[PDB]
Design an enzyme around this catalytic site. Structure first.
Site, PDB file in Angstrom:
ATOM      1  N   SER A 118      71.046  43.933  68.145  1.00 12.48           N
ATOM      2  CA  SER A 118      71.611  42.939  69.051  1.00 12.48           C
ATOM      3  C   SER A 118      71.340  43.633  70.509  1.00 12.48           C
ATOM      4  O   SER A 118      71.549  45.004  70.678  1.00 12.48           O
ATOM      5  CB  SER A 118      72.872  42.664  68.888  1.00 12.48           C
ATOM      6  N   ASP A 154      73.252  36.402  71.780  1.00  9.83           N
ATOM      7  CA  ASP A 154      72.309  37.387  72.171  1.00  9.83           C
ATOM      8  C   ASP A 154      70.954  37.078  72.468  1.00  9.83           C
ATOM      9  O   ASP A 154      70.620  35.726  72.072  1.00  9.83           O
ATOM     10  CB  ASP A 154      72.559  38.830  71.780  1.00  9.83           C
ATOM     11  N   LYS A 208      68.709  31.551  71.240  1.00  9.24           N
ATOM     12  CA  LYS A 208      69.255  31.301  69.833  1.00  9.24           C
ATOM     13  C   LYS A 208      70.121  30.181  69.873  1.00  9.24           C
ATOM     14  O   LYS A 208      70.602  29.441  68.787  1.00  9.24           O
ATOM     15  CB  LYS A 208      69.750  32.661  69.504  1.00  9.24           C
ATOM     16  N   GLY A 219      69.479  35.308  61.708  1.00  3.18           N
ATOM     17  CA  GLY A 219      68.964  35.533  60.284  1.00  3.18           C
ATOM     18  C   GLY A 219      67.498  35.543  60.452  1.00  3.18           C
ATOM     19  O   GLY A 219      67.117  36.018  61.454  1.00  3.18           O
ATOM     20  N   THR A 221      70.597  39.630  65.388  1.00  2.00           N
ATOM     21  CA  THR A 221      71.519  38.692  65.937  1.00  2.00           C
ATOM     22  C   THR A 221      73.091  39.086  66.238  1.00  2.00           C
ATOM     23  O   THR A 221      73.624  39.661  65.174  1.00  2.00           O
ATOM     24  CB  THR A 221      71.345  37.129  65.312  1.00  2.00           C
ATOM     25  N   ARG A 232      67.811  38.989  71.613  1.00  2.00           N
ATOM     26  CA  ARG A 232      67.005  39.972  70.986  1.00  2.00           C
ATOM     27  C   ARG A 232      66.488  39.321  69.653  1.00  2.00           C
ATOM     28  O   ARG A 232      67.272  38.950  68.939  1.00  2.00           O
ATOM     29  CB  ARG A 232      67.674  41.303  70.602  1.00  2.00           C
ATOM     30  N   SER A 241      74.313  40.133  62.488  1.00  2.00           N
ATOM     31  CA  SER A 241      74.543  41.517  62.027  1.00  2.00           C
ATOM     32  C   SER A 241      75.889  42.005  63.081  1.00  2.00           C
ATOM     33  O   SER A 241      76.318  43.020  62.705  1.00  2.00           O
ATOM     34  CB  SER A 241      73.349  42.347  62.249  1.00  2.00           C
ATOM     35  N   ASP A 296      75.759  46.732  68.152  1.00  2.00           N
ATOM     36  CA  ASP A 296      74.930  46.561  67.114  1.00  2.00           C
ATOM     37  C   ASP A 296      73.499  46.875  67.454  1.00  2.00           C
ATOM     38  O   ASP A 296      73.067  46.344  68.551  1.00  2.00           O
ATOM     39  CB  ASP A 296      74.976  45.163  66.773  1.00  2.00           C
TER      40      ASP A 296
HETATM   41  C1  04C Z   1      69.221  39.535  64.900  1.00  2.00           C
HETATM   42  C2  04C Z   1      68.261  39.927  66.125  1.00  2.00           C
HETATM   43  C3  04C Z   1      68.775  40.540  63.763  1.00  2.00           C
HETATM   44  O1  04C Z   1      69.956  41.472  63.616  1.00  2.00           O
HETATM   45  C4  04C Z   1      68.962  37.980  64.892  1.00  2.00           C
HETATM   46  O2  04C Z   1      69.580  37.705  63.279  1.00  2.00           O
HETATM   47  C5  04C Z   1      67.815  37.283  64.631  1.00  2.00           C
HETATM   48  C6  04C Z   1      67.706  35.596  64.445  1.00  2.00           C
HETATM   49  C7  04C Z   1      66.920  34.889  65.532  1.00  2.00           C
HETATM   50  C8  04C Z   1      65.962  35.495  66.075  1.00  2.00           C
HETATM   51  C9  04C Z   1      65.056  34.860  66.899  1.00  2.00           C
HETATM   52  C10 04C Z   1      65.210  33.473  67.207  1.00  2.00           C
HETATM   53  C11 04C Z   1      66.428  32.705  66.490  1.00  2.00           C
HETATM   54  C12 04C Z   1      67.177  33.692  65.569  1.00  2.00           C
HETATM   55  N1  04C Z   1      66.966  37.814  63.637  1.00  2.00           N
HETATM   56  C13 04C Z   1      65.648  38.385  63.775  1.00  2.00           C
HETATM   57  O3  04C Z   1      65.350  39.110  64.805  1.00  2.00           O
HETATM   58  C14 04C Z   1      64.584  38.356  62.615  1.00  2.00           C
HETATM   59  C15 04C Z   1      64.835  39.434  61.711  1.00  2.00           C
HETATM   60  C16 04C Z   1      64.662  39.461  60.180  1.00  2.00           C
HETATM   61  C17 04C Z   1      63.722  40.131  59.594  1.00  2.00           C
HETATM   62  C18 04C Z   1      63.563  39.980  58.161  1.00  2.00           C
HETATM   63  C19 04C Z   1      64.863  39.457  57.497  1.00  2.00           C
HETATM   64  O4  04C Z   1      64.803  39.511  56.053  1.00  2.00           O
HETATM   65  C20 04C Z   1      64.309  38.250  55.249  1.00  2.00           C
HETATM   66  C21 04C Z   1      65.920  38.738  58.198  1.00  2.00           C
HETATM   67  C22 04C Z   1      65.834  38.843  59.600  1.00  2.00           C
HETATM   68  N2  04C Z   1      63.269  38.447  63.112  1.00  2.00           N
HETATM   69  C23 04C Z   1      62.260  37.894  62.456  1.00  2.00           C
HETATM   70  O5  04C Z   1      62.278  37.216  61.235  1.00  2.00           O
HETATM   71  C24 04C Z   1      60.948  38.413  62.668  1.00  2.00           C
HETATM   72  C25 04C Z   1      60.434  37.651  64.021  1.00  2.00           C
HETATM   73  N3  04C Z   1      60.001  38.378  61.844  1.00  2.00           N
HETATM   74  C26 04C Z   1      60.007  39.092  60.742  1.00  2.00           C
HETATM   75  O6  04C Z   1      60.546  40.224  60.662  1.00  2.00           O
HETATM   76  C27 04C Z   1      58.921  39.015  59.673  1.00  2.00           C
HETATM   77  N4  04C Z   1      59.625  38.496  58.472  1.00  2.00           N
HETATM   78  C28 04C Z   1      59.792  37.064  58.004  1.00  2.00           C
HETATM   79  C29 04C Z   1      60.468  36.684  57.010  1.00  2.00           C
HETATM   80  O7  04C Z   1      60.389  37.422  55.810  1.00  2.00           O
HETATM   81  C30 04C Z   1      60.505  38.994  56.017  1.00  2.00           C
HETATM   82  C31 04C Z   1      59.795  39.350  57.194  1.00  2.00           C
END
Ligand code: 04C
Ligand code: 04C
Ligand code: CL
Ligand code: CL
Ligand code: CL
Ligand code: CL
Ligand code: CL
Ligand code: CL
Ligand code: CL
Ligand code: CL
Ligand code: CL
Ligand code: CL
Ligand code: CL
Ligand code: CL
Ligand code: K
Lengths: 230, 216, 233, 238, 244, 219, 199, 213
Positions: free
Chosen positions: F169, F17, F33, F47, F1, F19, F129, F166
């Site tokens: 992103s 964004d 988002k 997050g 994000t 993604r 990020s 990023d």
């Molecule tokens: C950007 C894209 C990441 O750089 C944003 O933070 C984004 C936030 C967002 C996305 C969709 C809707 C609303 C807000 N975050 C993600 O894309 C996020 C990535 C993530 C994975 C693991 C993390 O560590 C605990 C933190 C962030 N996406 C997810 O959670 C995806 C859909 N699911 C997984 O990766 C599975 N996770 C669940 C939690 O436990 C670890 C594995």
């Protein structure tokens, strides 16, 4: 320090009648009159808000309440008891939204709220609610009108009245109400059913009215009520 | 407490004829750092028993309030009964072991001085519930530095006058200041006697740094 | 209507006094403390010759050295008896010894007025036990007999009777007791008094007889042995 | 009456009948006498038999090395209060290593006995106690009742016909402070004797004695251990 | 003045004329008890209590009706003494809780406010009965000055210059009104407190009595304690001799 | 994000964004988002995806319920305190970094709230990020009392910078303008990347896949 | 953080830096760490941001109720005590030192340190990560009986010197002066910071 | 982290004869390389018939002795008599086991007389496994005390010695000797030796000085 009673305050009499429910029904049958009309393209709910004194601030408390964006409430009976049911109804509407991400079907809210009413006819150390609810709603492009009562029983209505002169208000509606009204017509026949049981002169301060359509539920402003009062 | 924050070093105790004398420096350290150089690590429990405390200061202030209230509670009844030095010692032992057994210890070492029924009292309390009585007491680094001094004098002279105890204590604080990196040159002396508890103001032990010229 | 922990103007708990009355409907039981042992005896009260003889158990074993005679509401008694048996074995486990007859009786006496409605557990007692008990046995203080009722009160007895015909048997023991009585005379006396106060004739299958003497443990009498003590009428 | 089934119901006169009904239970029990000198505290109680074949009831119980009690009323309520007192004395020794002062122990009874009088469904304690103890303040004689109230007394009697004993002690209350232990017990026995009907007097089977003081810990003499006190008896007069 | 059968059994039941009789009957218990007194002086507060000798077998100083709730706070009680002690314990815990939380001596008004909340709580339910006593709270400091409060079974608390509870609360109040307490020293007030108890006492209905006396002012350095045997006996003599 | 917030003369503006990543693979190219809380209070979540989703929906659920009970315009300071006390209770295990912005009777307001429950009120902020890229643009070009259009362009640039710099992103920059009059949720305001067009057809004539079993259920 | 409080005759002075940090990054370069607990009681925040703020809220909550129940402005001693108690009850779970300073009618201007759950009153107090670099300065530059303006300079100088040395401190200096008359909140900006040796 | 235990030294010995029991210990309380006190005897009177000796973590030994003291009173109010030597030993087993998952770092030995007046000794481990035996040692120097007793009291590894019954006099010297030997080798043993003699008359204590280094 305290700990409540664990025995039912509503029991079966030899006649097979739960007297406390019928006694709770008497509380609503003696309250200020209220009417609801399902009108093909919407719903209207109106009540007598006659505070019986000029000292009151008519704008401060309301009897027609929103439960969510698409659901509204009116009552006949006890105001304090009704408040409890409103708060419970709003929470149930949110509990449903959080789980399903979809506006609660009016039928489903009424069932959930009616079940709370049922509890107080069987649970220990409590009396039943002395309120009957009139719940309107819009979901799936269809208008809904429901009645909940102290029993925990619920009914679906095309049109109905409750409170003072609920019997006369009902027969009036039988003759007066016809299916396929426009919503603005329903506000008239709602205020007319209210006039049958009034006693005094109607000002926009004396009565309260809410409407529900495809655009959601809202209470009419005092200026809007005046325009219908002619 | 899992990890102590602000700590106090060695507390001293030794009993003379007609009472007991306790010493502790007015320092509260945050690790190696001297954070508070003018705080009291000693209290008057009542008119018969007194207490100096090593270790975590917040735990000492907590125990100071709990003991403070217990004395107040007892004074309210006014039934001719009061806590003896042994009774306070027994309570404290029971308190520390209880906290230790719940894996949540009060991070303190305690010295309890007292005078009652013509007899002098000196009791040791640990954070694990280790408790005993001795004619002389020293906690922390005192147990390695001051305690040898006291024992060597008490072997040669078991009974001391109040003056003799005082000058022995001042002599011990001199050793502690020289040798403990977690010590300071501001300290208090507490005394129990027939008259009660007397805590004396900020004191400094006399130091000599003439051995600084004896390296050539 | 009142609560279960209500005092009478007299100064007693109604439910206790009423529990005492329930015992007055129970079959009579006698215990005799002899210097050389304790004998317990009770009438079974057969309602039909179809009922199995040894089925009724109004004298039971608590421990090797302790016997208990029961009267009143039999169903209430057997809850108290299991508790007595549990206590002896808990005590055995913890202390590696047999309990005294006084302490066993004292343990059962602690359950006495532990009943109530409000400020109580989900499974707490609603009422007292409609039972009287005779604890008879031998410990390191010689042979002993103890009596207990629903008030919780317990006391040693040289000889005692409880049940429907309590006063009649009490008077019969009163004029027929020497603190120097032999065990032969002790069983005899109980058998003699039993037939007098009963509505039915003394049969070998009609009664239960038990002995706890220093040398041998608590003994339940067999029909053949009963016919030897009923031989001397 | 409808103001007398629950402790949580006040009478219009401003009274609680269920407390007073519990106070009746004390009066029905056999008499017990407590008195003290400047050095000793003595309990003397009358054992009772329901029949001649049954033994006599226990009247005097152990609490701690420095505290003893004599009971009057319900047995189970007495045993329950005794166990609370013992537990309090145990906790005091466990924590402080010194014996619990008599005043404070009685105060705990006063606080505990009060609780059930104010809660619905609960009931007052159907027992009154005479407490003899010795501590830093010397010997003590205390009195507790079904009502949570308690009294510090020079001498007291409770139970059946305790009024007679009460009057005896009231005449001789100035005597006790300089009394020798042997003279103190005889005073206690002489008061207990007044409670009995003229036909009967104190026997070795029906008299129980408890003594605590500066010399010794609390001791109960019952049968053979009691006759030294009874022998040397001024005769029952009228 | 009373209501039979139905409306006076529980404190969770109102009477038709808007009264809680369970509280009123508990208020009757204190009216039956012997009189407790206490009046605010220029430099402190004095307490006086008549203690009716039930039997001469009781110790002089038994059934203390004057309590130390906190070092600077004294309590004077009238009513069912068993309740009075539990409230003394509740009040003690409150003054203890305040120091534990805030680090200094409880302000008397607040102590009274807090204990009153606890009393009142026992007037609302069928599960418990109201407290059958009334009590006064007195303190002194240089900051807050002399303060005197009184709580009754309903849970009501008010400040006072002069106050009395029990048998002859009326006989006492009219005798208190006579005093210029706003100008009187607490050494003087004791003498007058002692005589009012003697006047109030019925020596022909009640058998006999003892006089309990308490301090809390500048002469005690702000600490609540008992009036010495010397000062009491001077005030007792004063009471007997101006009774003519 | 990458998410960002900005205060201007007539109100606030929020950016995000589109993604979402599962591991290091782009799961969603067009996820939303910027979340609805009140009609004039909005929240950007960064997050743990499911975590930012539930917290924000829970907050909105509590905010509608609050507005219903008071009959008043919801306060953004209420949203911020509800959010942080919820997140503090979970001790940072709910991985939700939030930028909450809205309009009150007390004017335009912008808050940021971290997963552990800490908050700060400020004219501009950035989370996620790609936050480094966004603050860089903001610290560079932010002025007090900007025009809506000057404020809308800077925010786009801030999110764009995050998207391009990023790896976590991408997609479109979503914007939400909140005025004392109303709120416009300009979804896919700007869209930097385009590749939908191609020249590779990979079709298969019915019957290239070898089949062993066929079953048809009439409805 | 760097936080500081100084006592004078009429009241107190409370200062702080304006930085919040996560690792090597600063996430807020303008944060006010001077939270009111009551009308004339402030507190200076350090340590975990979430932990600190949570303590500040509950302290302000209880002091509001306590203030109303006594119908009087809370004592500074009372304020310090409530913060001290929350800090002690959760010394393992909450990680923050809070300096509590203010003014009341009973005892005038007062300064309290509560680090770890202990309680001490001091003529002045410093706290935070940057406090290490100014222990020597405050010991040398302190005089008893400083005027409000002198105390104001003393805190400004000490915090300026800490911020320049400490990597975890930065931004502006927030100053509040609490007296009987009220609270004066002022901000010392980058151009306005006192200059010293910088090489 | 934080350790709930400290090692404080101390050895305890018990021997059983025809009409006597002996419980003996050093008076040294220590921690690390320092002595806490030289006046800490490990013997403790429970009844006129029974004496206990505890060693190891002094915090545990103190609290345990207080538990036993309270439990002794609980028994006597409930049973109307004193808890016998065998009963105390049985009770101690259960108390120690209730802490099977957070044990008392403690070595207990019980010395007294059985119901026949005969000498009885009970040896325990930190967790409550116990039995009766003629002689046993527990603590830091128990391995130093044991073999000599095995040889002299048990008559082990000997061919034509006539097997003389154990006398009080001989056992007293034996107790003294093994401790004199142990004080020379074990750094945790020294200062003074206290012997508690349990007999039909009661408990008599005796003190003999030891190495103070
Ligand atoms: C950007 C894209 C990441 O750089 C944003 O933070 C984004 C936030 C967002 C996305 C969709 C809707 C609303 C807000 N975050 C993600 O894309 C996020 C990535 C993530 C994975 C693991 C993390 O560590 C605990 C933190 C962030 N996406 C997810 O959670 C995806 C859909 N699911 C997984 O990766 C599975 N996770 C669940 C939690 O436990 C670890 C594995
Ligand atoms: C100075 C600037 C350096 O920390 C101050 O101490 C400052 C004080 C403060 C108080 C209230 C509101 C804002 C600022 N503290 C912080 O800036 C603080 C530093 C810190 C982080 C972790 C700690 O361990 C528990 C202790 C102190 N920064 C934060 O809390 C920021 C908002 N978030 C994080 O760093 C997240 N942490 C949580 C704990 O684990 C590591 C990641
Ligand atoms: Cl119920
Ligand atoms: Cl319910
Ligand atoms: Cl609306
Ligand atoms: Cl200090
Ligand atoms: Cl330590
Ligand atoms: Cl010792
Ligand atoms: Cl009884
Ligand atoms: Cl009586
Ligand atoms: Cl939330
Ligand atoms: Cl400093
Ligand atoms: Cl145990
Ligand atoms: Cl082993
Ligand atoms: K540290």
């Amino acid at each position: 320090a305290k700990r409540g009673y664990s025995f039912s305050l509503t029991t079966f009499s030899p006649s097979g009648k739960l007297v406390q429910i019928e006694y709770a029904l008497a509380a609503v049958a003696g309250g200020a009159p209220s009417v609801g009309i399902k009108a093909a393209n919407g719903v209207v709910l109106a009540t007598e808000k006659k505070q019986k004194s000029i000292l009151y601030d008519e704008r401060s408390v309301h009897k027609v309440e929103p439960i969510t964006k698409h659901i509204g409430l009116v009552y006949s009976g006890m105001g304090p008891d009704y408040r409890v049911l409103v708060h419970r109804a709003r929470k149930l509407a949110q509990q449903y939204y959080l789980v399903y991400q979809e506006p609660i079907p009016t039928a489903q809210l009424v069932q959930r709220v009616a079940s709370v009413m049922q509890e107080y006819t069987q649970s220990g150390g409590v009396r039943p609610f002395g309120v009957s609810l009139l719940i309107c709603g819009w979901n799936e492009g269809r208008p809904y009108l429901f009645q909940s009562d102290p029993s925990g029983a619920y009914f679906a209505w095309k049109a109905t009245a409750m409170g003072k002169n609920y019997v006369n208000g009902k027969t009036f509606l039988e003759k007066r109400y016809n299916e396929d009204l426009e919503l603005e017509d329903a506000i008239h026949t709602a205020i007319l059913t209210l006039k049958e049981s009034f006693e005094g002169q109607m000002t926009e301060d004396n009565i309260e009215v809410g409407i529900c359509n495809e655009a959601g539920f809202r209470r009419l402003t005092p200026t809007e009520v005046r325009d219908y009062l002619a | 407490t899992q990890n102590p924050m602000v700590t106090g070093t060695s507390v001293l105790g030794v009993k003379f004829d007609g009472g007991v004398v306790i010493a502790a420096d007015m320092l509260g350290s945050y690790g190696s750092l001297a954070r508070f150089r003018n705080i009291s690590r000693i209290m008057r429990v009542n008119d018969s028993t007194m207490l100096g405390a090593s270790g975590d200061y917040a735990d000492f202030q907590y125990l100071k309030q709990v003991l403070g209230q217990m004395v107040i509670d007892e004074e309210l009844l006014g039934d001719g009964h009061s806590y003896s030095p042994r009774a306070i010692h027994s309570w404290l032992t029971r308190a520390m072991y209880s906290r230790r057994s719940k894996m949540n210890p009060l991070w303190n070492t305690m010295v309890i001085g007292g005078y009652a029924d013509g007899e002098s009292f000196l009791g040791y309390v640990d954070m694990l519930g280790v408790a005993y009585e001795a004619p002389s007491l020293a906690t922390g680094y005192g147990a390695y530095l001051a305690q040898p001094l006291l024992r060597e004098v008490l072997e040669k002279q078991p009974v001391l006058s109040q003056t003799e105890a005082r000058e022995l204590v001042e002599r011990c604080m001199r050793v502690l200041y020289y040798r403990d990196a977690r010590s300071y040159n501001r300290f208090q002396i507490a005394t129990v006697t027939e008259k009660g508890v007397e805590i004396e103001g900020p004191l400094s032990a006399q130091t000599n740094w003439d051995i600084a010229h004896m390296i050539s | 209507d009142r609560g279960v922990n209500t005092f009478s103007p007299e100064g007693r708990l109604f439910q206790v006094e009423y529990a005492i009355e329930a015992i007055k409907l129970g079959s009579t039981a006698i215990g005799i403390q002899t210097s050389e042992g304790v004998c317990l005896a009770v009438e079974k009260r057969i309602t039909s010759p179809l009922m199995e003889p040894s089925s009724i158990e109004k004298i039971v074993e608590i421990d090797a050295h302790i016997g208990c005679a029961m009267s009143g509401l039999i169903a209430d008694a057997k809850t108290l008896i299991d508790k007595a048996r549990v206590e002896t074995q808990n005590h055995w486990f913890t202390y590696n010894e047999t309990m005294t007859v006084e302490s066993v009786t004292q343990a059962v006496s602690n359950l006495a007025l532990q009943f109530g409605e409000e400020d109580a557990d989900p499974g707490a007692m609603s009422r007292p036990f409609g039972v009287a008990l005779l604890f008879g046995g031998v410990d390191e203080k010689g042979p002993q007999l103890f009596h207990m009722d629903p008030s919780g009160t317990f006391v040693q007895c040289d000889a005692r009777a409880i049940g429907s015909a309590s006063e009649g048997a009490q008077s019969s023991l009163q004029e027929v007791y020497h603190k120097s009585m032999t065990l032969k005379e002790a069983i005899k006396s109980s058998l003699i008094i039993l037939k007098q106060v009963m509505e039915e004739k003394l049969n070998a299958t009609n009664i239960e007889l038990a002995t706890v003497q220093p040398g041998q443990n608590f003994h339940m009498f067999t029909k053949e042995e009963l016919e030897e003590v009923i031989k001397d009428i | 009456n409808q103001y007398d089934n629950d402790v949580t119901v006040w009478s219009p006169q401003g009274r609680i009948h269920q407390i007073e009904y519990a106070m009746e239970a004390v009066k029905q029990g056999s008499a017990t006498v407590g008195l003290k000198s400047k050095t000793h505290a003595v309990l003397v109680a009358l054992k009772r038999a329901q029949s001649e074949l049954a033994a006599h009831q226990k009247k005097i119980l152990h609490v701690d090395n420095h505290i003893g009690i004599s009971i009057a009323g319900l047995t189970a309520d007495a045993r329950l209060l005794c166990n609370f007192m013992r537990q309090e004395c145990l906790d005091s020794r466990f924590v402080f290593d010194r014996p619990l002062p008599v005043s404070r122990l009685v105060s705990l009874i006063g606080s505990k006995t009060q609780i059930p009088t104010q809660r619905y469904g609960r009931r007052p304690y159907g027992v009154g106690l005479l407490i003899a103890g010795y501590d830093d303040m010397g010997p003590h004689i205390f009195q507790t009742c079904p009502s949570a109230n308690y009294f510090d007394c020079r001498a007291m009697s409770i139970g059946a016909r305790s009024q007679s004993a009460r009057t005896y002690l009231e005449r001789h209350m100035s005597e006790f402070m300089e009394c020798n232990l042997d003279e103190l017990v005889k005073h206690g026995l002489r008061a207990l004797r007044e409670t009995l009907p003229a036909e009967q007097d104190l026997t070795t089977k029906n008299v129980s004695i408890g003594i605590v003081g500066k010399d010794l810990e609390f001791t109960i003499y019952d049968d053979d251990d009691v006759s030294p006190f009874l022998d040397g008896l001024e005769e029952r007069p009228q | 003045s009373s209501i039979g059968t139905g409306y006076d059994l529980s404190a969770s039941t109102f009477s038709p004329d808007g009264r809680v009789f369970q509280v009123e009957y508990a208020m009757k218990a204190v009216e039956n008890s012997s009189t407790a007194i206490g009046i605010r002086c220029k430099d402190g507060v004095v307490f006086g209590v008549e203690k009716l000798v039930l039997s001469k077998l009781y110790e002089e100083g038994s059934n203390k009706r004057l309590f130390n709730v906190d070092r600077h706070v004294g309590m004077a009680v009238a009513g069912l003494l068993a309740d009075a002690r539990s409230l003394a314990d509740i009040a003690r815990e409150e003054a203890s809780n305040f120091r534990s939380n805030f680090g200094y001596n409880i302000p008397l008004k607040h102590l009274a406010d807090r204990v009153a909340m606890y009393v009142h709580a026992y007037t609302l339910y069928s599960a418990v009965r109201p407290f059958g006593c009334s009590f006064m709270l007195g303190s002194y400091s240089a900051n807050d000055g002399a303060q005197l409060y009184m709580i009754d079974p309903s849970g009501v608390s008010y400040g006072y210059w002069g106050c009395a509870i029990g048998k002859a609360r009326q006989a006492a109040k009219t005798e208190i009104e006579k005093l210029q307490m706003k100008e009187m020293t607490c050494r003087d007030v004791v003498k007058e407190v002692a005589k009012i108890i003697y006047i109030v006492h019925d020596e022909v209905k009640d058998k006999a009595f003892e006089l309990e006396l308490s301090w809390v002012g500048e002469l005690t350095k702000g600490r609540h304690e008992i009036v010495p045997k010397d000062i009491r006996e001077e005030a007792e003599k004063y009471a007997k001799e101006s009774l003519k | 994000t990458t998410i960002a917030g900005l205060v201007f003369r007539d109100g606030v503006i929020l950016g995000a964004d589109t993604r979402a990543t599962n591991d290091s693979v782009v799961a969603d190219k067009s996820c939303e988002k910027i979340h609805f809380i009140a009609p004039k209070i909005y929240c950007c979540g960064a997050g743990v995806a499911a975590d930012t989703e539930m917290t924000t929906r829970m907050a909105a659920s509590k905010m509608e319920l609050h507005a219903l009970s008071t009959g008043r315009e919801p306060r953004v300071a209420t949203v911020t305190r509800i959010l942080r006390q919820t997140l503090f209770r979970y001790q940072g295990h709910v991985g939700a970094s939030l930028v909450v912005g809205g309009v009150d009777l007390n004017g335009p307001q912008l808050y940021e709230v971290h997963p552990h429950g800490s908050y700060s009120r400020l004219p501009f902020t950035a989370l996620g990020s790609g936050q480094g890229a966004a603050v860089a643009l903001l610290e560079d070009r932010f002025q007090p009392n900007m025009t809506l259009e000057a404020a809308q362009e800077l925010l786009v640039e801030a999110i764009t910078a995050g998207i391009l710099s990023d790896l976590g992103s991408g997609g479109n920059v979503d914007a939400c303008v909140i005025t004392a009059g109303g709120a416009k949720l300009q979804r896919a305001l700007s869209t930097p990347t385009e590749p939908v067009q191609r020249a590779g057809r990979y079709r298969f004539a019915p019957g290239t896949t070898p089949v062993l079993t066929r079953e048809v259920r009439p409805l | 953080t760097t936080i500081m409080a100084v006592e004078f005759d009429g009241g107190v002075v409370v200062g702080s830096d304006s930085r919040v940090s996560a690792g090597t990054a600063v996430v807020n370069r303008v944060f006010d760490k001077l939270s009111p607990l009551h009308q004339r009681i402030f507190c200076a925040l350090s340590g975990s941001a979430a932990d600190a703020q949570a303590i500040a809220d509950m302290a302000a909550y209880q002091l509001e109720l306590h203030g109303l129940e006594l119908e009087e402005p809370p004592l500074v001693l009372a304020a310090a005590n409530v913060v001290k108690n929350i800090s002690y009850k959760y010394r393992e779970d909450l990680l923050a030192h809070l300096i509590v300073a203010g003014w009341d009618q009973r005892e005038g201007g007062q300064v309290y340190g509560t680090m770890g759950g202990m309680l001490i009153r001091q003529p002045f107090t410093i706290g935070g990560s940057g406090s290490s670099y100014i222990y020597g300065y405050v010991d040398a530059a302190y005089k008893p009986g400083m005027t409000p303006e002198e105390c104001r300079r003393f805190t400004t100088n000490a915090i300026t010197l800490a911020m320049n040395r400490d990597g975890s401190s930065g931004g502006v200096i927030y100053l509040v002066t609490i007296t009987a008359a009220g609270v004066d909140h002022r901000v010392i900006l980058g151009d306005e910071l006192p200059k010293f040796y910088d090489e | 982290r934080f350790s709930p235990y400290a090692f404080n030294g101390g050895t305890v010995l018990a021997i059983a004869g025809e009409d006597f029991s002996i419980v003996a210990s050093d008076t040294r309380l220590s921690e690390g390389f320092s002595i806490h006190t030289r006046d800490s005897p490990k013997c403790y009177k429970l009844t006129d018939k029974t004496v206990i000796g505890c060693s190891g973590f002094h915090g545990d030994c103190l609290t345990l002795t207080k538990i036993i003291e309270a439990r002794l009173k609980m028994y006597k109010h409930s049973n109307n008599k004193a808890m016998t030597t065998g009963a105390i030993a049985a009770m101690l087993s259960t108390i120690l086991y209730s802490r099977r998952f957070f044990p008392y770092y403690v070595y207990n030995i019980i010395g007294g007389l059985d119901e026949e007046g005969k000498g009885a000794v009970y040896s325990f481990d930190p967790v409550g496994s116990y039995q009766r035996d003629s002689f046993k040692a527990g603590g830091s120097a128990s391995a130093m005390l044991q073999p000599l007793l095995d040889n002299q009291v048990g008559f082990k590894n000997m061919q034509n010695v006539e097997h003389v019954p154990l006398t009080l006099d001989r056992a007293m010297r034996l107790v003294k000797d093994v401790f004199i030997s142990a004080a020379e080798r074990d750094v945790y043993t020294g200062d003074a030796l206290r012997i508690c003699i349990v007999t039909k008359e009661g408990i008599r204590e005796e003190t003999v000085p030891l190495r103070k280094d």
